[PDB]
Amino acid sequence: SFSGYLKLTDNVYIKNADIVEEAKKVKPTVVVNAANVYLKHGGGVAGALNKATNNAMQVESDDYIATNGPLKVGGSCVLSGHNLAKHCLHVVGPNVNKGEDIQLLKSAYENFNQHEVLLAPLLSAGIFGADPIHSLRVCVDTVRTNVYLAVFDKNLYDKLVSSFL
Ligand SMILES: Cn1cc(C(=O)Nc2ccc(O)cc2)cn1
């Protein structure tokens, strides 16, 4: 199972880890992708997860978009986890670099409550432009299921743990 995680709360755990390497190791039931509404997995966590699937995630995602249209900011969809997980929960956190409503981050984290356990990144963090300290706070105050957060950046991981209230 998950190893080397620091327990933050009853249900939230955190580790300084590459979520792709963590997914290949754990092979969780659910890996969360930091998706955009178009499921265009170009960069950040999405680009890394997609590259690990040899682009199979993008091929599946394009078929999903062709059939269903784009997701909502704050929404999600369950697709295959390919070689990384049983499922991938593609969750769209607001991208503050695209001027999206930061208040939608709580709605984005609510998607995690539909799954008993997840391996996830901090939503809207990284190239999505939100403050990761704020994202972790929304995560702990919203998610009730067991969430194992992988934070790629060591310096950010240390800042998140040392400032966690
Ligand atoms: C590697 N990495 C660093 C960050 C970061 O520091 N983001 C950030 C954005 C807005 C803020 O108000 C404060 C911090 C995200 N990923």
Using the mean position of ligand 1's atoms as its centre, give its distance from the Cα of residue 69 in Å. 30
Spatial CB neighbours of 58, under 8 Å, sequence gap ≥ 6: 39, 40, 41, 50
Q: Is 65 exposed, middle or buried (0-12, 13-18, 19+ CB in 10 A)?
A: middle
What lies within 8 Å, CB to CB, of 23 at 6+ separation is: 31, 49, 52, 81, 84, 85, 119
Tokens of 33: 């992708």
Q: Which amino acid is at 96?
A: V
Instruction: Write the Ramachandran bin of 97: left for phi over 0, alpha for psi from -120 to 50, otherwise beta.
Output: alpha
Mutate to test the pocket of ligand 1, among 153, 154, 157, 163 (most ligand atoms within 8 A of CB): 153
**22 CA to centre of ligand 1 in angstroms:** 22
How far is the C-alpha of 98 from the C-alpha of 64, rounded, in Å? 23
Task: List the determination method.
Answer: X-ray
Q: How many other β-carbons are positioned within 10 Å of the β-carbon of residue 36? A: 21
Please state, in angstroms and rounded to a whole number, the distance separating the CA atoms of residues 125 and 134: 9
DSSP three-state, residue 141? helix
Query: Which residues form ligand 1's pocket by a CB distance below 6 Å?
Result: 125-126, 129, 131-132, 153, 156
- Ligand 1 atom with the smallest distance to the CA of 129 is 9
Contacts of 26 (CB under 8 A, 6+ apart): 1, 2, 119, 148
Protein residue with least CA distance to atom 15, ligand 1:
126
Contacts of 53 (CB under 8 A, 6+ apart): 82, 83, 84
